[PDB]
Design a protein around this ligand. Structure first.
Ligand SMILES: CC(=O)N[C@@H]1[C@@H](O)[C@H](O[C@@H]2O[C@H](CO)[C@@H](O[C@@H]3O[C@H](CO[C@H]4O[C@H](CO)[C@@H](O)[C@H](O)[C@@H]4O)[C@@H](O)[C@H](O[C@H]4O[C@H](CO)[C@@H](O)[C@H](O)[C@@H]4O)[C@@H]3O)[C@H](O)[C@H]2NC(C)=O)[C@@H](CO)O[C@H]1O
Ligand SMILES: CC(=O)N[C@@H]1[C@@H](O)[C@H](O[C@@H]2O[C@H](CO)[C@@H](O[C@@H]3O[C@H](CO[C@H]4O[C@H](CO)[C@@H](O)[C@H](O)[C@@H]4O)[C@@H](O)[C@H](O[C@H]4O[C@H](CO)[C@@H](O)[C@H](O)[C@@H]4O)[C@@H]3O)[C@H](O)[C@H]2NC(C)=O)[C@@H](CO)O[C@H]1O
Ligand SMILES: CC(=O)N[C@@H]1[C@@H](O)[C@H](O[C@@H]2O[C@H](CO)[C@@H](O[C@@H]3O[C@H](CO[C@H]4O[C@H](CO)[C@@H](O)[C@H](O)[C@@H]4O)[C@@H](O)[C@H](O[C@H]4O[C@H](CO)[C@@H](O)[C@H](O)[C@@H]4O)[C@@H]3O)[C@H](O)[C@H]2NC(C)=O)[C@@H](CO)O[C@H]1O
Ligand SMILES: CC(=O)N[C@@H]1[C@@H](O)[C@H](O[C@@H]2O[C@H](CO)[C@@H](O[C@@H]3O[C@H](CO[C@H]4O[C@H](CO)[C@@H](O)[C@H](O)[C@@H]4O)[C@@H](O)[C@H](O[C@H]4O[C@H](CO)[C@@H](O)[C@H](O)[C@@H]4O)[C@@H]3O)[C@H](O)[C@H]2NC(C)=O)[C@@H](CO)O[C@H]1O
Lengths: 113, 113
């Protein structure tokens, strides 16, 4: 199954640029550029519509840490981790850590491609 | 300046749950949940509207690697890196590498929060 969402691309100055960059942004997020896009902040930010898969499959995997906002306990981290990982189109491994006390934590995610 | 995009949150089964989960997804992406959300794939995926900043500012930073899709050369990576990093709400550091020949590459991004 698939769905669509707009993904930031930084400022895009013309449709010609957007049509060429959109596919690259989509590939980075394991999706497909739909061709639709728009500038959301004049001369500062544009977004591209990307079709994503509900479930990413494949024989390869890559693990890394991404921002998860502040997580105050392992209990909270184990509960929210799966959903935060899903927001990155990945899975939560269960590993995580606060990188700045009282400010920010990160969760380890696993990409499948 | 701020702009909005819908961010995946995995399946959300009720507004009651979405109102509790949306803020957490938003925080992980350095944004604010607006309260608006919707299921895009019945019983499988929902998205939450998040207000993002054109430029993420703050006194802290965090570097990490994320998927960039396959990058075929340093010339291409240096050209697309900034835009791919922007799609993650971060900056490109210039460092990158292919993790699976002919299939996937990753770029190092720098979050500021
Ligand atoms: C950062 C910055 O300020 N840059 C601006 C540039 O944005 C601007 O160039 C124009 O940018 C607009 C978007 O902001 C372009 O209009 C959008 O075009 C895309 C693509 O549409 C084409 O391709 C599709 C797929 O092939 C076709 O289906 C479609 O028919 C077209 O052939 C559309 O997806 C957008 O539509 C969405 O957004 C608009 C709102 O913007 C909604 O109304 C729609 O319902 C839909 O949701 C836009 O139509 C425009 O083409 C760009 N112009 C040129 C000449 O490239 C640039 C020049 O003004 O200025 C920079 O500063
Ligand atoms: C925003 C803020 O300030 N919040 C803090 C809270 O962070 C803090 O709660 C503790 O937070 C730390 C992380 O900073 C927790 O420790 C980490 O736990 C995870 C999860 O480990 C469990 O689950 C895994 C999966 O099931 C199991 O494999 C594992 O055995 C555990 O059961 C680990 O992934 C981390 O370990 C990794 O990272 C560290 C650091 O790089 C490495 O050294 C390790 O080798 C490993 O790679 C940590 O162990 C800790 O559990 C939290 N404590 C509690 C009680 O919940 C809170 C309290 O201090 O204060 C808030 O303010
Ligand atoms: C995985 C799965 O299948 N899950 C489904 C659940 O989705 C479903 O529960 C309903 O889900 C729908 C969305 O899919 C909910 O409707 C949306 O509600 C949000 C929130 O709206 C409230 O909160 C806002 C902020 O406080 C207020 O402004 C607003 O007035 C409400 O109080 C809205 O943001 C959505 O609106 C957007 O999307 C719709 C399309 O869905 C557009 O038409 C709108 O224009 C807008 O863009 C929706 O209105 C609904 O509330 C959920 N129902 C309940 C009872 O929780 C559940 C039951 O049907 O079944 C699960 O399986
Ligand atoms: C999908 C696919 O198969 N594509 C491959 C291409 O990858 C391949 O092109 C080469 O790709 C490698 C990466 O896999 C390139 O090497 C990396 O380059 C970046 C950038 O380095 C430059 O820029 C930095 C910033 O300006 C400078 O600091 C640096 O000095 C350079 O000027 C580096 O960040 C990488 O370094 C990391 O990885 C290596 C290897 O793991 C570590 O040793 C380092 O410590 C660090 O962690 C790499 O050095 C390489 O430049 C690409 N080659 C060319 C000619 O573009 C292509 C050709 O082989 O084939 C495709 O199929």
């Amino acid at each position: 199954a698939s769905y669509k969402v707009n993904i930031p691309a930084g400022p895009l100055w013309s449709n010609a640029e957007a049509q060429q960059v959109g596919p690259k942004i989509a590939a980075a997020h394991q999706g497909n550029f739909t061709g639709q896009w728009t500038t959301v902040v004049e001369s500062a930010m544009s977004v591209v519509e990307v079709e994503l898969q509900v479930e990413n499959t494949g024989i390869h995997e890559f693990k890394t840490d991404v921002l998860a906002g502040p997580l105050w306990s392992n209990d909270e981290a184990q509960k929210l981790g799966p959903q935060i990982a899903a927001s990155y189109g990945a899975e939560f491994t269960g590993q995580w850590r606060t990188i700045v006390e009282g400010v920010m934590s990160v969760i380890q995610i696993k990409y499948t491609f």
